[PDB]
Amino acid sequence: PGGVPWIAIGDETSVTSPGALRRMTSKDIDEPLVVVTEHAIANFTKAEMALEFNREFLDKLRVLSVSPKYSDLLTYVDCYVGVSARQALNNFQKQVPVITPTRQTMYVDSIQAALKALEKWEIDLRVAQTLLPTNVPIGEVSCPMQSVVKLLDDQLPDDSLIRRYPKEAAVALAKRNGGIQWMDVSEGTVMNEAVNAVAASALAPSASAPPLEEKSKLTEQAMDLVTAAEPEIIASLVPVPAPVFAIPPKPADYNVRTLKIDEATWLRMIPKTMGTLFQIQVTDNTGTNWHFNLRGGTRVVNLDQIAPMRFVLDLGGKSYKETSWDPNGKKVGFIVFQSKIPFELWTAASQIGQATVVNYVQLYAEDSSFTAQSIIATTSLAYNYEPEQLNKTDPEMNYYLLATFIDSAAITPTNMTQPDVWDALLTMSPLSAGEVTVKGAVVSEVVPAELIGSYTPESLNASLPNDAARCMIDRASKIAEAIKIDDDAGPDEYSPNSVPIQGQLAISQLETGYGVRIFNPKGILSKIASRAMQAFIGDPSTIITQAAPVLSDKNNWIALAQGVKTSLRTKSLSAGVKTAVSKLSSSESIQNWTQGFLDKVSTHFPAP
Amino acid sequence: PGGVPWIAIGDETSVTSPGALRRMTSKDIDEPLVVVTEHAIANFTKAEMALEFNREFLDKLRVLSVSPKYSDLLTYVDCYVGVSARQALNNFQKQVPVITPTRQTMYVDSIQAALKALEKWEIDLRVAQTLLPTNVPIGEVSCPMQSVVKLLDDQLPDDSLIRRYPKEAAVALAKRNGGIQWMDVSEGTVMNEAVNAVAASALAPSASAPPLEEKSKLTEQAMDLVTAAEPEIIASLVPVPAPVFAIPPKPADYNVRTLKIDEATWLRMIPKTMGTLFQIQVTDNTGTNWHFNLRGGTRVVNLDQIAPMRFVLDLGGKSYKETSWDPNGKKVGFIVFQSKIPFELWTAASQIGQATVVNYVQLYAEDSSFTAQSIIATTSLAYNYEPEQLNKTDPEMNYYLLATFIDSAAITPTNMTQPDVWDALLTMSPLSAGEVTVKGAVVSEVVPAELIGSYTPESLNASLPNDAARCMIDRASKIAEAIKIDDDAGPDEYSPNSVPIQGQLAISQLETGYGVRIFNPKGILSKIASRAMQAFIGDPSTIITQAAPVLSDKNNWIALAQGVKTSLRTKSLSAGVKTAVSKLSSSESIQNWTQGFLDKVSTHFPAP
Amino acid sequence: PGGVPWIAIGDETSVTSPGALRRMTSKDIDEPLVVVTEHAIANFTKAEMALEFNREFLDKLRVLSVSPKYSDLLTYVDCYVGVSARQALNNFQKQVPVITPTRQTMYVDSIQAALKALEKWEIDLRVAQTLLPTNVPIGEVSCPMQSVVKLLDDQLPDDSLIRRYPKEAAVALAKRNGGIQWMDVSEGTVMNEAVNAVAASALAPSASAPPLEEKSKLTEQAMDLVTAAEPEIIASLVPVPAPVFAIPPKPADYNVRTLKIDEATWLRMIPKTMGTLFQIQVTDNTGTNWHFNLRGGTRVVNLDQIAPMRFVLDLGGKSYKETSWDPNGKKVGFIVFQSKIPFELWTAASQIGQATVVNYVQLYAEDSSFTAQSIIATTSLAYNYEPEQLNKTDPEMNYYLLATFIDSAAITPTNMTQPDVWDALLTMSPLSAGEVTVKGAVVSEVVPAELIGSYTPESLNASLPNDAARCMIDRASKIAEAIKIDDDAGPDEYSPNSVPIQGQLAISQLETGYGVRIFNPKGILSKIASRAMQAFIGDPSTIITQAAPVLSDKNNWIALAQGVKTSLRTKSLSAGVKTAVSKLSSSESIQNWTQGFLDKVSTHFPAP
Amino acid sequence: TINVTGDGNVFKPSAETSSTAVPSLSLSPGMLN
Amino acid sequence: TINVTGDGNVFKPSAETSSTAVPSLSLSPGMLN
Amino acid sequence: MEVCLPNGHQIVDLINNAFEGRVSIYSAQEGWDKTISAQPDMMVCGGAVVCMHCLGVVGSLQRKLKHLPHHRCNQQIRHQDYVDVQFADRV
Ligand SMILES: CCCCCCCCO[C@@H]1O[C@H](CO)[C@@H](O)[C@H](O)[C@H]1O
Ligand SMILES: CCCCCCCCO[C@@H]1O[C@H](CO)[C@@H](O)[C@H](O)[C@H]1O
Ligand SMILES: CCCCCCCCO[C@@H]1O[C@H](CO)[C@@H](O)[C@H](O)[C@H]1O
């Protein structure tokens, strides 16, 4: 049952339109009413139990002797039920649990007020249950209850409430641990006082199987990973909108100077050996004029098409010390150019279009471990590339980013000869998680399957932080994580998660293609598939890496990505054979350890 | 129902005090009894189903022909119910499901023993369902059942149980896949034998919506992230206890030599250009005497106030090679000083107070890629700063950490001129997750909201691994992750998660402040808000970064942090419009791919 | 109830064998039938509510006026119930909810089709609820409803459906937010129209306790972490199969040149000072011949026993510039040797056995920040070590990996004197997640407990990416994460998660061992335990680190690992004392902030 | 029959009335059977 | 009526009797309705 | 066995080698030895082994190849389409 109670506005049974109904209120049994669901009843009732676990203490504390009892506040009523009038109109119900907001609140506040009172007792009681082993993974262990109490008495914190209400603590423990039993002085009787036998049955191992709760949970955790990865998205063969494909990105590091321009498509460079060299002047947003030189070798970042991006430059550790130039006290800055002329063609100050020094810092140098070298202090020169702020209009406009030495005095070309200060650590951070790029430039949509096996190690390393590959890799790794939670296959052993590839391979070698055909027996295809899966789990980026043995083929990827869903969903509270034995074998060793400890306890706190 | 069964100690109905009750035992229908909950019944019953999916196999295996049937072991009884006597006392129930621990255990052991038997069959059966596509994301696909069996027969592992019980495997599959149907040879009849139609209905897409289970799960995963982030804590405007605010920290790297002392408040340095230079002697904890020099430039870590911290120094890659000093075979060590005199003021050995060489390693050098330079092998010189071990008493006591060359022979000042060996990679790891610092020093509590926009890039980089900002960032990123799971907004598009900022901005520009006021139409504030949110998701550290466009204002942060809760909680099994289409579009392409593959199968394993 | 409906094949009641039964079909009330579970009923019914929250809008939209109503399509039937015939055979049921697949699908499609229609309305309605605060963490806040509508009208997107159906939007909001109430113009009456009072009761704080849903969720999240860590595995004292122990690994970086060979057991080196030097020739897989020299200092990776592994070498930033050798334009490659002679003994070309240049790249150099030095561009020289591809047979066979300069022309020994180009950044990535190594070599199984305190910082740093320690650390950190979610203990304060260690310590100092015995009062053992736990949470790797104060002892580890399970499981919807106050204190400050904002709203959009 | 622009309307957000709709339900396969 | 210091008391932890209280319940909004 | 195109930098490498006469060519007739001319079946482009019939990557320098790998080849790359490189290299 669920929703709200509706009563015939005025006419008994002759109710026909949604208008003939009205929110049944308290004045019909002046707050409005609400249907208390089957679920809500079951759970809030279980909440009450939370208090009853410490009934003996609560009373000895003279507080909340009136245990809440939810079913008591409920009022069963015959009425039309629904969230809306229309739905309610065709749904009459007999004996609907109902309650007013105020009473629901008053109830919960009683449970909470109670828990607040148990606040410390709750902690002190847990402290007693973990000071020494109160449980064991498998089997059973024992210790002279008197030795146990001796120990507690010798170690519990002075302010423990247990020291003030020993007998109440006894009940409290016995109420939740079937293994802790207090003999009735009256009838010399002793027995399990725990109220959680059913629950514990799901947390214990059988002679040859791990706990059902564990097998269930773990398998559930594998499926949540697969769902979060989104099989349909990462195995899609058609375009997927960038916003939909993307996920929270991570930063990336580069040394713009050591990148290869035929690999990092977002860099431009003035060719050396041309004697190109020209001094220019640019102002910062406060009108201050700056001097710097552009020459053969100078590199810049082609801002256009990289999407929102934050740049942070760290010249820490570098030298830049020359015969007639000391970086100490000098200044470096980020300059953003706006010109119609391609950067590679620059040779005169007249071609730089519109330029602005967007940020700068003063450097501090000292002596490094390397003799004769100066070491520059760490910097954090930042620049946020916000496409909307630049507002590119003219399609022939190029947007460039440079990092060089800037000075209030013209920089003598023969003193400071470096082309720029890009030989530093650059950290890029996307300023958006709704745009994706592929090898340097923005794309409005991605085709996940075509990413498979299309990146060389060089290309991946040079891609921007918001590259589709990088994203594909982070989504894929959730699949790898999932497969590993369920798969305990050793080297070359088949499994429900490796065979999907084997299937593709089996058919693939039969398909008519080109080149020398080969035939592998099922047994060998089975291994190749196993190794492919292992390589994937150990390095998820292999799927987007060129020529990667088997994962380089989009078909094997799709088969695996999609297969996993079936592999997990068709399980029945099961656990790997290899795993099942290992778990029990391990649980036993821990049980044994537990006993050996309890013995030491008995030995150092002897029973009378 | 739930708890334990209570019976009137001796007097029928005349029960009044909790004492008038006793734990109803087996001898009343000699173990004590337990209430089997509505929940436990529903779930353990579903566990039984796990076995029945393979009934045909289990029997052909002559094991557990007696399918457990839980409701059978239950014994309904009229009694008082509760975890405690008092609660039970005012809660009489008719027909309470009851059971003894031993029987509950015996039951589960029957289910587990059964699953243990299905161990391999479970795996081989899944292997058959993933070798080739057994499902499809959307729509339907087909293949000659004979071709499918041909394939399986050609590829399944030799030891597959399926090869030994083909017909049982058939039923098993048909029992869980409505798409696999075996014709009855008897009546030429063929039909869906699956027992999971209801379940599958939640996993399938409708003509224009993704599966309900998916929409539900993903939204659930976003909320768990928001809950784990703790909105009330990260948006709090009042102090929050360090222990409560903190979370498991991560290590950080620094090169103490390249840090700026006006940025890293935990470093002290002896001023250069003063001709300061003095040789000292200190012993290690084994009484061995060591020699080393302190001079202009020497830096130390001010240990006081940084909280428990582990230091590890790596001189790998560095040179330290000088005209009359070769690092090869030399030794470096960590020295901890205890003096009342500020380090900057040191010039004579008499001011160093109490010193101890706490650790040292011998270096190994070789030749590096850089000619004329020697490269030092990797080191892992460690030191754990435990405040309690030092036991600072005198408030005028300073605690310093140094890293220099130490030797058994006096180190000639003109041979080894370096101030220290801090030009190395230092890795700091907090030795506590209950203490937090802010810009170098410990604080007993944090005000999350004041952290917003108060760190410069320089300052963040120099902060200690246990800095509040770093923590704020890791908690905040869970929010960013959450928003992205739900938001598929493209550039400049509004969304339920961006507008909270827009609201603050809308009012903010109206508030009377100081400076030139500006008025932006809703349309522009909407975009600015969108970009702010994107920048946040792409770089969560923007919220604690100074002058960060919109996230630099604590009000926009609080609005966002708190808004997300409402944004997610008021959803109704929904999914982004852009996403909904993309999913179905992608599912279709996969379905098509699935068919194309099944065709290849039919082609290479033709039906008769 | 659950499974499928079974009817007596032909004979009423005289049913005895499973054969006497048949899948009850639609032709008995021609699709087969399925049992609709208690669970399925409750949840799909709640799905319908999703639509009814917007009934007023749906109708004004003239679509799906026929609210689905699931209980309507159900057909109750008396029959035998079960997944199999046998189970069903001994389980007759009266009034079993039943339905055909087609109808179940038709039903869900009605709900989905409806949600698809609500697609935008859903978003626009959430946008209205987050534009300004629609909720508050604790307490209550208010604002002139007219001011609120003024604001919305001034800020909502033009295309908002709310602008087109204001009154429907009103109902919609009021239906889910008890705080939004619209006065009935008719009777001047005003009241809570929300249908979710019960739910909200679990999300609100009581005078001194955080929301029950929060306390529940967080504790649940701690337990999932502990389950995923697998206490039985990480605390096991007996061997655990590598596949079972391992988890998805991460890459590691090294500079093979700076590693200490007495630390990294996977490296071999030709001794210097022996005048060893010899030029050799090897071909690549395309038959092309290459030249390179091996000499004193040359290092190689001993491939044997490291498990599947990918190597990627980055010479970026390095120089290698010598008087008669310029790296610019030169080539480096990975060479794999197969010889029976140990590498250390090599001195002549005749001892290298079988060699192949497996990959190579051409280098690009430029000028670095360091004068007189050349800086090599970034490289990504890769090599995948697949043990199965090498196929080691002869036990005396050694497999080596080298990285040097290779050239088409003999490399003059006096020109290029470097031993190799291993002074670079090497990144190793496991190509398998089913194999584990311990300090350089593969092991078929691990004994988790013996890993405790057996690694020095040096050794850990030199271990391979697939080292057991590294894995142990990643599993253990899930435990640390779990403890922190639940523990808000400050410095030196005991807790349910620290005492387990205290217990071990308490007994340990009593055990008869060797050496000077010491006795610490409970009070001091309590602290030491606290600090140990904090150090663990702040740096999980301390457990596998040698001499690590308390976590270096396997007993304290096992006690902690196992203790946590009990610590969490015996909680009752509780939250730390320190936390409880902090949460409420913070919720209040946010509530106050919320009000202050609503005031600004009222001020800038005054009510009439 | 309400006036979005009228008086007598109420805007009092409170912890006790936390808005919620139907974010997620229990739809796992094993539970639905 | 028990003696924490007396005999006849029992301390036998076992897998079958794993202690537990009420760590967490099902309180999501969509479920409580 | 689906194949992908080589990356930009790998084609740049092919060209650079060609003008040093060191492109590694494989023909079914002569194998990896290009002493005797024959139509190219595969060429090495910056580490990758490319099929000269579709220009797809069918291998790498890591694993040795004795024949042109069996792959789903579009077979639309004609000799005339890359002979300019072959000419450059041989000359
Ligand atoms: C549930 C079992 C709890 C056992 C813990 C017992 C702790 C003993 O507590 C001690 O008991 C003594 C005798 O009453 C008192 O004199 C001491 O002050 C008190 O600290
Ligand atoms: C559920 C459908 C499973 C189809 C898998 C069929 C695998 C066939 O299995 C084969 O059957 C032959 C004929 O009985 C035997 O002679 C072979 O030994 C056996 O391996
Ligand atoms: C649930 C409460 C929603 C309040 C939002 C009100 C948005 C007002 O919307 C405006 O109303 C005016 C008068 O009808 C129209 O003339 C405008 O075109 C319309 O945009």
Ligand SMILES: [Cl-]
């Ligand atoms: Cl549930």
Ligand SMILES: [Zn+2]
């Ligand atoms: Zn081809």
